[PDB]
Amino acid sequence: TMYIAFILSTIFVIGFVGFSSKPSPIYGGLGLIVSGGVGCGIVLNFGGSFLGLMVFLIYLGGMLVVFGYTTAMATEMYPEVWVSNKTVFGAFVSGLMMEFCMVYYALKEEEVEIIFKFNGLGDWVIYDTGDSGFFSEEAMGIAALYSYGTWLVIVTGWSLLIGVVVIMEITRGN
Amino acid sequence: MNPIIYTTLIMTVMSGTMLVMISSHWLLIWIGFEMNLLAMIPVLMKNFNPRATEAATKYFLTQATASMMLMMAIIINLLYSGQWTITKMFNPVAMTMMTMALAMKLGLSPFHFWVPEVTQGISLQAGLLLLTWQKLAPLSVLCQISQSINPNLMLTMAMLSILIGGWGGLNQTQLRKIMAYSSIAHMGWMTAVLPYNTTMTILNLLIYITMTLAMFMLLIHSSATTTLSLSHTWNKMPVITSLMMVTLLSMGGLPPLSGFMPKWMIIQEMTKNESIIMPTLMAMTALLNLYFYMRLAYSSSLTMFPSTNNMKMKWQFEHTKQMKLLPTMIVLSTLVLPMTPALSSLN
Amino acid sequence: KTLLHKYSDIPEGTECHRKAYASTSIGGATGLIVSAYSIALKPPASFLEGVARTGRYTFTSAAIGAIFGLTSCISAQVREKPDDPLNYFIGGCAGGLTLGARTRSYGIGAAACAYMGLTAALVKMGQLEGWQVFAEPKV
Amino acid sequence: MNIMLTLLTNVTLASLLVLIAFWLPQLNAYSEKTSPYECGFDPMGSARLPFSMKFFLVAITFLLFDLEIALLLPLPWASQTNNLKTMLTMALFLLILLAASLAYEWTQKGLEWAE
Amino acid sequence: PGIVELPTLEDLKVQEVKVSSSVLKAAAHHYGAQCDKPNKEFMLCRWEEKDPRRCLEEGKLVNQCALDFFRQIKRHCAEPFTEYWTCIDYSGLQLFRHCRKQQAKFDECVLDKLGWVRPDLGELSKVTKVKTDRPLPENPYHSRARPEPNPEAEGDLKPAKHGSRLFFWTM
Amino acid sequence: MPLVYMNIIMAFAIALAGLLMYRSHLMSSLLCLEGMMLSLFIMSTLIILNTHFTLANMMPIILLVFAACEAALGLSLLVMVSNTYGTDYVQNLNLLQC
Amino acid sequence: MMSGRPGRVPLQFLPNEARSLPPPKLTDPRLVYMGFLGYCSGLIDNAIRRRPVVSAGLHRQLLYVTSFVFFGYYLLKRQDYMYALRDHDMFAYVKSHPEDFPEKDKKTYGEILEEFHPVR
Amino acid sequence: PFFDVQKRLGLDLDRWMTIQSAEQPHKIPGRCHAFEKEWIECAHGIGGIRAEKECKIEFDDFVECLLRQKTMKRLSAIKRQRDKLIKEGKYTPPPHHLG
Numbered sequence A: 001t002m003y004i005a006f007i008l009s010t011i012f013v014i015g016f017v018g019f020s021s022k023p024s025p026i027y028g029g030l031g032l033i034v035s036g037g038v039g040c041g042i043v044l045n046f047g048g049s050f051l052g053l054m055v056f057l058i059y060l061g062g063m064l065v066v067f068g069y070t071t072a073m074a075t076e077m078y079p080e081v082w083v084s085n086k087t088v089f090g091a092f093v094s095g096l097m098m099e100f101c102m103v104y105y106a107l108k109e110e111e112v113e114i115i116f117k118f119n120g121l122g123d124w125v126i127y128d129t130g131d132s133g134f135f136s137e138e139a140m141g142i143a144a145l146y147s148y149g150t151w152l153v154i155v156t157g158w159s160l161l162i163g164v165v166v167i168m169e170i171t172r173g174n
Numbered sequence B: 001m002n003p004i005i006y007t008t009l010i011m012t013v014m015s016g017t018m019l020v021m022i023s024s025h026w027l028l029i030w031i032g033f034e035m036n037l038l039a040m041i042p043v044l045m046k047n048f049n050p051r052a053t054e055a056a057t058k059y060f061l062t063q064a065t066a067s068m069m070l071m072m073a074i075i076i077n078l079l080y081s082g083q084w085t086i087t088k089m090f091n092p093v094a095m096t097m098m099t100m101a102l103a104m105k106l107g108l109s110p111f112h113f114w115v116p117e118v119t120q121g122i123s124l125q126a127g128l129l130l131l132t133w134q135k136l137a138p139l140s141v142l143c144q145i146s147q148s149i150n151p152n153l154m155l156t157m158a159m160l161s162i163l164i165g166g167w168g169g170l171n172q173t174q175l176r177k178i179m180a181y182s183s184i185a186h187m188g189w190m191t192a193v194l195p196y197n198t199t200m201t202i203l204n205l206l207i208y209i210t211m212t213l214a215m216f217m218l219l220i221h222s223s224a225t226t227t228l229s230l231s232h233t234w235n236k237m238p239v240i241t242s243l244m245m246v247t248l249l250s251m252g253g254l255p256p257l258s259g260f261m262p263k264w265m266i267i268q269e270m271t272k273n274e275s276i277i278m279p280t281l282m283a284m285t286a287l288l289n290l291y292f293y294m295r296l297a298y299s300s301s302l303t304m305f306p307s308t309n310n311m312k313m314k315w316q317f318e319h320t321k322q323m324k325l326l327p328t329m330i331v332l333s334t335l336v337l338p339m340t341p342a343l344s345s346l347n
Numbered sequence C: 001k002t003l004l005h006k007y008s009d010i011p012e013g014t015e016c017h018r019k020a021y022a023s024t025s026i027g028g029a030t031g032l033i034v035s036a037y038s039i040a041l042k043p044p045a046s047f048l049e050g051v052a053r054t055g056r057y058t059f060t061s062a063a064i065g066a067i068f069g070l071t072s073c074i075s076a077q078v079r080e081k082p083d084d085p086l087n088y089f090i091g092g093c094a095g096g097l098t099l100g101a102r103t104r105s106y107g108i109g110a111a112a113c114a115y116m117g118l119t120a121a122l123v124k125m126g127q128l129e130g131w132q133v134f135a136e137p138k139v
Numbered sequence D: 001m002n003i004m005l006t007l008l009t010n011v012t013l014a015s016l017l018v019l020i021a022f023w024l025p026q027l028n029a030y031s032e033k034t035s036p037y038e039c040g041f042d043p044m045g046s047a048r049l050p051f052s053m054k055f056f057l058v059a060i061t062f063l064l065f066d067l068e069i070a071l072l073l074p075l076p077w078a079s080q081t082n083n084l085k086t087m088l089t090m091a092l093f094l095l096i097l098l099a100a101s102l103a104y105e106w107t108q109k110g111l112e113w114a115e
Numbered sequence E: 001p002g003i004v005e006l007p008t009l010e011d012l013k014v015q016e017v018k019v020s021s022s023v024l025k026a027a028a029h030h031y032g033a034q035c036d037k038p039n040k041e042f043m044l045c046r047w048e049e050k051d052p053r054r055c056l057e058e059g060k061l062v063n064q065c066a067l068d069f070f071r072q073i074k075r076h077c078a079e080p081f082t083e084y085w086t087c088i089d090y091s092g093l094q095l096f097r098h099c100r101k102q103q104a105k106f107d108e109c110v111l112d113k114l115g116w117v118r119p120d121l122g123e124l125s126k127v128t129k130v131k132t133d134r135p136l137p138e139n140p141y142h143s144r145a146r147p148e149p150n151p152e153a154e155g156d157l158k159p160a161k162h163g164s165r166l167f168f169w170t171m
Numbered sequence F: 001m002p003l004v005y006m007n008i009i010m011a012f013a014i015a016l017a018g019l020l021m022y023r024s025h026l027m028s029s030l031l032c033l034e035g036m037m038l039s040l041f042i043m044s045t046l047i048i049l050n051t052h053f054t055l056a057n058m059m060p061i062i063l064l065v066f067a068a069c070e071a072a073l074g075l076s077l078l079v080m081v082s083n084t085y086g087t088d089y090v091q092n093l094n095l096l097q098c
Numbered sequence G: 001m002m003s004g005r006p007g008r009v010p011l012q013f014l015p016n017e018a019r020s021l022p023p024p025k026l027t028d029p030r031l032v033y034m035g036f037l038g039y040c041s042g043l044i045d046n047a048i049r050r051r052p053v054v055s056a057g058l059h060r061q062l063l064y065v066t067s068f069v070f071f072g073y074y075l076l077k078r079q080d081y082m083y084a085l086r087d088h089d090m091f092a093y094v095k096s097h098p099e100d101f102p103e104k105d106k107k108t109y110g111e112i113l114e115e116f117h118p119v120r
Numbered sequence H: 001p002f003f004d005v006q007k008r009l010g011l012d013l014d015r016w017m018t019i020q021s022a023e024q025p026h027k028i029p030g031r032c033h034a035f036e037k038e039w040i041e042c043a044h045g046i047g048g049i050r051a052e053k054e055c056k057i058e059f060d061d062f063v064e065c066l067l068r069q070k071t072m073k074r075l076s077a078i079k080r081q082r083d084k085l086i087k088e089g090k091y092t093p094p095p096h097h098l099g
Helices: A005-020 A025-045 A049-071 A086-109 A137-143 A150-170 B003-022 B026-044 B050-081 B092-106 B114-121 B124-144 B151-170 B175-193 B198-222 B238-251 B260-271 B277-302 B311-315 B326-335 B337-346 C002-009 C016-041 C047-079 C085-102 C106-129 D002-021 D053-072 D084-107 E021-026 E028-034 E036-049 E056-090 E100-114 F003-020 F026-050 F055-085 G016-020 G029-048 G058-096 H005-009 H033-043 H047-054 H056-066 H069-086
Strands: none
Touching: A005 A025, A005 A086, A005 F003, A005 F026, A025 A049, A025 F026, A049 A137, A049 D053, A049 F026, A049 F055, A086 F003, A137 F055, A150 B003, A150 B026, A150 D053, A150 D084, A150 F055, B003 B026, B003 B124, B026 B050, B026 B124, B026 F055, B050 B092, B050 B114, B050 F003, B050 F026, B050 F055, B050 H056, B092 B124, B092 B151, B092 B175, B114 B124, B114 B175, B124 B175, B124 B198, B151 B175, B151 B277, B175 B198, B175 B260, B175 B277, B198 B238, B198 B260, B198 B326, B198 B337, B238 B277, B238 B326, B238 G029, B260 B277, B260 B337, B326 G029, B337 G029, B337 G058, C002 C016, C016 C047, C047 C085, C047 C106, C085 C106, D053 D084, D053 F055, E021 E028, E021 E056, E028 E036, E028 E056, E036 E056, E056 E100, F003 F026, F026 F055, G016 G058, G029 G058, H033 H047, H033 H056, H047 H056, H056 H069
């Protein structure tokens, strides 16, 4: 129970290795949604309740769902399987071992310098000490989209309407 | 497409570019790039052939990958500074990520492969938009963050762009691929002086956009996309081919034409910084661009290729539509060298 | 840069074995990069064909590096002239000759002798006179 | 963490029900028994039957509507601001843009299951 | 660099107010009414100084004022207060609205036996003022001196001497 | 930096490598793009929650919606390519070499 | 260089301190070349549109000329103001930093020993 | 911005989310509000070139606040040196540190 965010992050990276080794896209999507679930859990452990539930509802139940639906239509006659290629196994194995080596090095050394400097002193350590009062600071920051973020709403809504128009232009096929 | 929908998509492309150029916040700059790409993809697929679809797909893949890398650079910068303002990057690897993303969006040499294929695969109007308007946003971001770029990375990419644009364009008979390789070389010329003087980058961009607009409008006026099709244009409208020849000479940077101004100013500004070998290399390498420009001029205006019997039909017909601002673009691309000190207005 | 630092900090015309090793390392690294790009953009028909192409490019470049280093350093120490661009010219021409041998063509060998010798002499001149390839902005 | 225990219990009991369900019965299987069911005959595999642009278009339009819904979810907390006129203007703006996307899809064929 | 200076353990000792959240909530309105002076004085110190270590004795006075407030509750109707905070304690959100009968006979105690009127809606949320003796902190941020600014532009614009001076151009 | 950040940035690097190293299917590359976006979302969320940059709490929402719009666009492109060639194989997208 | 200059208000083609410089003369050679550029644009417009290049659409060629001169006058003002600003800042910086710009001690060629190189 | 339309038209299009010391909802403070404020008040109006050297202390304190790297190093040293003396049976953590 002492370490929860680290198992979650290691599983996150494992799922990333799994779907980025690119088996047939249905198993890649399964790995992506496993990664998304554990990442939603990660941000739940950081106090990002609304953001993680957004991950769930819109990413895993929306965007993914649509991805798997579209894969179920444009696939191979025998939709492929993970095992069918030695390349998938090699990529997944290399990614898993580079995960294991670096997490072991960071755990037992705490001063790795792979591009960035890292210290696995813990993950609870960086949390600050204070009271947030009678509201969720995350929800207040996100609800400010309609009061502070007028410009953001304007450009995002315009881009979504343009996205509808754009999709209907491209898919017409003439 | 519907004329209203096409106008809206064009306006959304320009508004994404403007969002890039007017924002002080990295998230809004990323939003502008996203909006530009979203509106740009349909204008590439306006004709809708498998070539157009493949051009749009390759364009989308490169631009989306670049956008994700740009967002990662922004997030690393925020991780180390807590800053969203577009200013010097506070992290070196974030700066490297951002430089590579912006070069991939521009199509610089190590990320140049998409430019020739996409330009060939789309129509001349789409290519005109692609090689003129789409350079503004990444170059403006680069000019804003120029004080923190690694000069070695940028200069490497610019020199490679010049070399590859020169060499790749040597082998082309397709006018769109020739335009794309010329664009790669000119982007290299723009980005070489970027570490030293962003005003020179703006000047070179304006001159290049003028020349590219003139050349693409002449091609659209001619309806020619191959060198042999252009070789018939003398027997229809020789004025177009002579104007095209002077424009190609301008593109080669031959004095006293307008295309010589950016090279001359950039060489001067570089020698001001004890940079002598690189300007000499760049000027020498541009002779390749001038070589295939001169090949096009030979096939188009300076000599007369065989025509066809069916060309007599086209003689009795005028153009239904007329290219806007083409005479102005032609004069600006050839005759503006005496006005060079006005470049300080860009300061 | 450490690959180039280890070549640069050892003085000219001394410790010819060390300088030859450093130039061989630079050659092998550059050949590895060119092999990576060649394998990426013009892929082979099999893994072994790619390994063969990689080894061919790498040995050609490493042999050019080793030959340039040996000839440059030895001609420097033999003549007692470690600041003369002529030792680097001889090195570049010997590198061109071994590139011609690797491609087994006298024309490539002669052209490469001339071009690489002149290039290496220019590099020596730029080292002696402080020429900058990428000059940092100042004004 | 209570919720983690609850999820573990639910998943564990569902998998246990699988194990009893999928191992307890007595089996005797032959080739024609497990043949794919096609109302008394054999099915044709054909080649990638799940097609038609309409199934993909409804998915894409649901995706974009779901993104706008993601933009609408913070609304219960958005009404707790002192600057209520701006918030109301922006929420109604987002809903007009949702209605405009629906109307544009509607009028330009869009939502139709054509011939 | 530098030592973070810390109070000792006995600089931090105080008579604790050891009553629970429901007991605290039940008396909260009369507590705000009766204990405003040291409470607002300590909150002034905390926001003015941005330092827990600078306001310890004010917090120690906060504690004493709370303690004496509760000892005044204890000697007159500890029993109605006890019933009221018990009823408040039952509900899982410690709601006031479920305990109005008990709040009623707690409130008509302190009036008759102690004089304590209960603050109206909005009074406890007011920004008030405190007449403190503590000097106003001069540099609460411990700021360095700010950098000297670049010299401004003075003088009138004159035309460029010999013009642009760009190469051969004379204007 | 804490090791969760290490693993999140590592996930982004793995998604980038998986996208740059192509295979036959286009959908696999699009899923790698989506993984890159998801890692960006989580990194942004962790940074924003940890430093209590309250107004920046909305930034992950904007990133998610814009990246999903791009994903819809890419899905439409894949569907057009498949309707052309019956598959989403990138090797069929090579007729612009000439 | 000039982007972050103090007082430099955005999107302002001529700032108000430019009104202290002399405006360019009407017969300014650069302005006349601007008009010539407009005239060439009109001629090329006649050529491309397949009209008699010299005598067709005198109003159009005329408008080409006057619009080119109109833009050129303001371009000349902005260019001259930018160069005036450049000189202003250079003189201010030399004044504020006398140590970086010492007064060089002048010497005559009668006391300066220059090396003679024979041509022979 | 390349074209500072916001500062010409007086509009606040995206400057409100640009720093964590800007005005926040319900006045919720940023975690590094004082550090950012001090660095910004040091670096104001002297240009980035000067601000990079002359405001180095404020930016270093800000970066330490954001990513507590040196704090984490010191805590890690204390932890691992504590264990370095548990094994030898040297140091007994006190009752308030064990329960």
